[PDB]
Amino acid sequence: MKRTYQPNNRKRAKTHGFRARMKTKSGRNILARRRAKGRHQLTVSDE
Amino acid sequence: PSAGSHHNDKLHFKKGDTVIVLSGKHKGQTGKVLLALPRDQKVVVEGVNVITKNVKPSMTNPQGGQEQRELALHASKVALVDPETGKATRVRKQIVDGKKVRVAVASGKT
Amino acid sequence: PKMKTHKMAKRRIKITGTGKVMAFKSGKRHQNTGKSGDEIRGKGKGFVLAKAEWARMKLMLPRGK
Amino acid sequence: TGKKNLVVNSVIRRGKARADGGVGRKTTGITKRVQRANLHKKAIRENGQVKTVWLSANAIRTLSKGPYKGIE
RNA sequence: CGAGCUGGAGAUACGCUUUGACUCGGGGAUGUCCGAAUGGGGAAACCCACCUCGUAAGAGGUAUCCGCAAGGAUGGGAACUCAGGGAACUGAAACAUCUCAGUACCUGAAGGAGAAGAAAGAGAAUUCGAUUCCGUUAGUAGCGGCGAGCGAACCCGGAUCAGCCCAAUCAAGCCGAAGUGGCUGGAAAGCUACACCUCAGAAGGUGAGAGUCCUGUAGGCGAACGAGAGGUCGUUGUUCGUGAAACGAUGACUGAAUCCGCGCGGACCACCGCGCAAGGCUAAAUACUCCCAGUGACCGAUAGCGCAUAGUACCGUGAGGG
RNA sequence: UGUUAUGGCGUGCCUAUUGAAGCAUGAGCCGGCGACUUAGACCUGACGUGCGAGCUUAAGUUGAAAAACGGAGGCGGAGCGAAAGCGAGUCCGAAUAGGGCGGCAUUAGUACGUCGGGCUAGACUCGAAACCAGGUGAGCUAAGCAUGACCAGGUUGAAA
RNA sequence: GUAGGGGAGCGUUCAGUCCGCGGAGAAGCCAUACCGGAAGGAGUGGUGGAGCCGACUGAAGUGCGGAUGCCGGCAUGAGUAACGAUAAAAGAAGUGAGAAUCUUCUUCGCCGUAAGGACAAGGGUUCCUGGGGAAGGGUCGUCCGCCCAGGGAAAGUCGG
RNA sequence: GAAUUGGCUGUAAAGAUGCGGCCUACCCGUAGCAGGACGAAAAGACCCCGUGGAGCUUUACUAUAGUCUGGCAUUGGGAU
Ligand SMILES: [Mg+2]
Ligand SMILES: [Mg+2]
Ligand SMILES: [Mg+2]
Ligand SMILES: [Mg+2]
Ligand SMILES: [Mg+2]
Ligand SMILES: [Mg+2]
Ligand SMILES: [Mg+2]
Ligand SMILES: [Mg+2]
Ligand SMILES: [Mg+2]
Ligand SMILES: [Mg+2]
Ligand SMILES: [Mg+2]
Ligand SMILES: [Mg+2]
Ligand SMILES: [Mg+2]
Ligand SMILES: [Mg+2]
Ligand SMILES: [Mg+2]
Ligand SMILES: [Mg+2]
Ligand SMILES: [Mg+2]
Ligand SMILES: [Mg+2]
Ligand SMILES: [Mg+2]
Ligand SMILES: [Mg+2]
Ligand SMILES: [Mg+2]
Ligand SMILES: [Mg+2]
Ligand SMILES: [Mg+2]
Ligand SMILES: [Mg+2]
Ligand SMILES: [Mg+2]
Ligand SMILES: [Mg+2]
Ligand SMILES: [Mg+2]
Ligand SMILES: [Mg+2]
Ligand SMILES: [Mg+2]
Ligand SMILES: [Mg+2]
Ligand SMILES: [Mg+2]
Ligand SMILES: [Mg+2]
Ligand SMILES: [Mg+2]
Ligand SMILES: [Mg+2]
Ligand SMILES: [Mg+2]
Ligand SMILES: [Mg+2]
Ligand SMILES: [Mg+2]
Ligand SMILES: [Mg+2]
Ligand SMILES: [Mg+2]
Ligand SMILES: [Mg+2]
Ligand SMILES: [Mg+2]
Ligand SMILES: [Mg+2]
Ligand SMILES: [Mg+2]
Ligand SMILES: [Mg+2]
Ligand SMILES: [Mg+2]
Ligand SMILES: [Mg+2]
Ligand SMILES: [Mg+2]
């Protein structure tokens, strides 16, 4: 049957993207929080 | 945790100096410094000497072939010698010229 | 943390010279027209707790007062 | 927001049953205690040239007397 | 500094270096594209322009807010600081005031600290004299469904001292004492026989355990650059829960005296005392610890950080976990 | 010592229970990790030590391959009362009769340490269902909006 | 003799001090008929290859069989179920260390509004050539969508 | 849990391969069956208990978004 994850480049970028995350204080707060954890993958646009 | 760390990456002797082997199997044999590596504290002296093997490689030559070459040693089994004493000897830094630093014993100098 | 003093026990309990503990007899606030006059007299008073009840009170006010 | 001084801020607000009695009832019990907020109003006057802005009430009186730095 | 070097990488080749390399210290030049991003757009790291110079190559400019200008701002920073907003579980062996707690969390602004500060004060001696911090007073005085429980301050002793103006030496580095012989052993530092330096027996490395083999230590030297008002209603703050409720604090309404005047001293009056509000700045003692150094009756591979390194592999759309 | 034959004898362990071999719980096995602690200058006892009608410092200061100073404070020294206040007395009372107390027929405390226990804190370890805050999610699914796509062939035969 | 109270001790790390061992060989590991009232403790021998015992004193992350405990390794079930559509295979030939599985030939069988062909979304070198064979392939592989290397993708007019 | 794991009748916490008595049974396995091993799985979801929880209901208690309402402010002049 049709499963949850149904890949869509533009979806992913527009939703979990760097521009997206920067558009809001809470997403900015993710960015900083992640940087802090030392993630290789700051954000989806890093893939 | 490199070997030079303990000895401040510093060689207590130069390349081309003659050296007496203080410690080990080659006690006292003598030779010219052919190669000296400060950071690793390893030094080559025409006396240690081993038989190494060249295994498969068709260069040099298809067959194997063995070989006689000296194997470097740890700085701390090396010393500058003193032409008089002829033996294992410490070093003092004194002066000459004309801005040159030099190396004496209890009776300079090498 | 300094052990606090049990503020309820302030106005109702007394330490004694030796080291026993006292309080006031009870039933004196609307159980009056009862009476009897000797009860009313005997109650307004004061008195020593039986004994089992001593340790707790002592622990209620560490300063004695 | 006020003309002179920010304003808005508040203030919880409480209320109490068994309200009163013989100056002492038994006592006043209080059933409420929540959280509210206070405010002011609006009208248009000037400064340096042409503005409009919000005005407190205390501001409209204070300014109707004379300009405490801004004009009418 | 003075002989090696050509990164972890250990691998072949090319080669560099006593005309001073490599490494260390110190300044500069270059510094693509994204990111406050700031020419315009955009699904970050990509697409599209305009202007001035230039021969083209190329270079520079083109955001918003304060300002005339010069110049300033935006963003980031683990904790620490102040401010706007502000939980519940829970405790009360049920619960609603109460408590958890002005804690968690959210937002803001800022610094290497910050806050606070120069008495309309604390107070009861007609005493003290800016603030913060530590001890203490003290679980005292008080608060409280007077239940659970909450809880000062003054004095005294310390840390550090400060009050002025306005409106009519450390950061590269160099020098640096003194031992040999025999024995065991694969190997000498160990054994042994005599021997020496010590302002130096801290420590690490050396084929096992080395004061005297190497690096060092005590001690000395050391740079062109480098661094040092009142009121009433509604509420609330401190021990302050409407209590007899003073005082500060504002949201609403209202609104006085200026020296024989004004504000306080816990309703309120007289008296007696302390005080000069409505105008601003202020270092020092204090907090924290991303980073650096030293230490340890701390850990040594299920321990210790999650990592002998990795926020990787791996899981998740993502936040996030790991 | 190992191993065995035969005889006698014999209902795993833990937990939980009135009562477990129980057909009650836990557990495949072995190895490692794995649970009564810390704190305060709190409370109260036991033991010990130093001073002893007295005992002790805290912050801090200086020194620091050590410790010394530091008396502010705290504990004993008197009790009794709601308190004022009185004081070997005190309180009730008008005095008596009584309670508490001193003397008593005698009685030592204080600072530190180790221990037993109390309190407050996660307070022996592991375990909820939940409650609250800030955020991440409509690439699944429930719908809306804009914009495109798609429905072999056959039957039936309404109005006009 | 259960909860519980009390008493004397055993062993573990770390710490101070004393004794003192150790390449003619430490800790750890292994075997053992000896010792002590018990925790426990020595003797000898085998292992190992660089640190460590005894005594007194101090401080603890200090003693395990349990917690459907945690991490890890290995057992049982067991050579058991299964090897993923009942569309189906046969021979020759080649290759190769090895072939029911790879390559070629000849046939056979199964889809044929599909099980054929072309886009989009998504994936990301999986395409082509040459090589490889540990693991991945539910067997086997000499083969592969796996591993190694090198090549390959061309726009004024298709899409943006 | 470990197993060297029969039947009857009895006894035991009251449903015994393990306890008692008596009976039966040489050792090992393969294909098969499902009576037992109170067989496995899920710390019973019925039931009770806990001064546990949560959704929901009301004329249970308490508050409250919202909403009606008097007074004050924006808010002024005149005529009866
Ligand atoms: Mg060099
Ligand atoms: Mg831009
Ligand atoms: Mg507030
Ligand atoms: Mg609640
Ligand atoms: Mg409760
Ligand atoms: Mg900021
Ligand atoms: Mg008021
Ligand atoms: Mg209040
Ligand atoms: Mg006031
Ligand atoms: Mg290990
Ligand atoms: Mg039972
Ligand atoms: Mg029992
Ligand atoms: Mg059984
Ligand atoms: Mg059982
Ligand atoms: Mg049970
Ligand atoms: Mg089981
Ligand atoms: Mg004593
Ligand atoms: Mg004590
Ligand atoms: Mg306890
Ligand atoms: Mg006994
Ligand atoms: Mg020791
Ligand atoms: Mg050890
Ligand atoms: Mg176990
Ligand atoms: Mg299970
Ligand atoms: Mg396991
Ligand atoms: Mg078989
Ligand atoms: Mg079977
Ligand atoms: Mg079978
Ligand atoms: Mg089968
Ligand atoms: Mg198949
Ligand atoms: Mg078949
Ligand atoms: Mg052949
Ligand atoms: Mg086949
Ligand atoms: Mg052929
Ligand atoms: Mg197809
Ligand atoms: Mg592509
Ligand atoms: Mg295979
Ligand atoms: Mg081949
Ligand atoms: Mg291919
Ligand atoms: Mg063409
Ligand atoms: Mg049998
Ligand atoms: Mg029976
Ligand atoms: Mg039987
Ligand atoms: Mg038996
Ligand atoms: Mg069956
Ligand atoms: Mg149950
Ligand atoms: Mg309302």
Where in chain D are the domains?
Answer: 1-72
Residue found by looking up tokens 């006043």 in the block = D28
Which domain covers residue B49, as residue numbers? Answer: 1-110
> What are the start-end ranges of the E strands in B25-69?
30-37, 42-45, 50-53, 66-69
DSSP one-letter code for D49: B
Distance A31 CA to ligand 20 centre (A): 71
Radius of gyration over every alpha carbon of chain B, rounded to an integer in angstroms? 17
Cβ of residue D13 lies below 7 Å from strand H: yes
CATH fold for the domain made of D1-72: Ribosomal Protein L24e; Chain: T; (2.30.170)
Find the Å distance, CA of residue B87 to C1' of nucleotide F10: 86
D23 backbone dihedrals φ, ψ, rounded to 5°? 55, -35
The CATH number given to C1-65 is 4.10.410.60
For residue B21, the tally of other CB atoms under 10 A from its CB is 20
- Protein-covered nucleotides on strand E (Cβ within 7 A): 2-5, 18, 35-36, 42-45, 75-78, 84-87, 97-98, 107-108, 138-151, 174-181, 186-189, 204-207, 210, 213-216, 234-236, 241-244, 250-255, 306, 310-313, 316-322
- Domains of chain C, residue spans: 1-65
How far apart are alpha carbons D17 and D32 in whole angstroms?
9
For residue A5, the tally of other CB atoms under 10 A from its CB is 5
How far apart are alpha carbons C17 and D3 in whole angstroms?
70
Nearest to B2 by CA among B38, B49, B56, B48: B38
DSSP one-letter code for C4: P
Closest nt to A3 (CA→C1')? F140
Distance B31 CA to ligand 42 centre (A): 104
CB D27 within 8 A of CB D44: no
How far apart are alpha carbons D5 and D55 in whole angstroms?
10
Structure determined by: X-ray
How far apart are alpha carbons B33 and B72 in whole angstroms?
10
Q: Beta partners for B59?
A: none
Q: For this experimental structure, what is the resolution in angstroms? A: 2.9
Strands B42-45 and C21-23: unpaired
How far apart are alpha carbons D68 and D58 in whole angstroms?
12
> Hey, is C9 helix, strand or coil?
helix
Q: Which distant-in-sequence residues (6+ apart) come within 8 Å of D22 by Cβ?
A: none
Q: Beta partners for B101?
A: B95
Strand E: which residues 14-73 of B lie within 7 A (CB)?
Answer: 14-15, 22-27, 33, 35-39, 41
CATH fold for the domain made of A1-47: Helix Hairpins (1.10.287)
Find the Å distance, CA of residue D71 to C1' of nucleotide H30: 112
Distance D11 CA to ligand 8 centre (A): 11
Q: Beta partners for B73?
A: B43
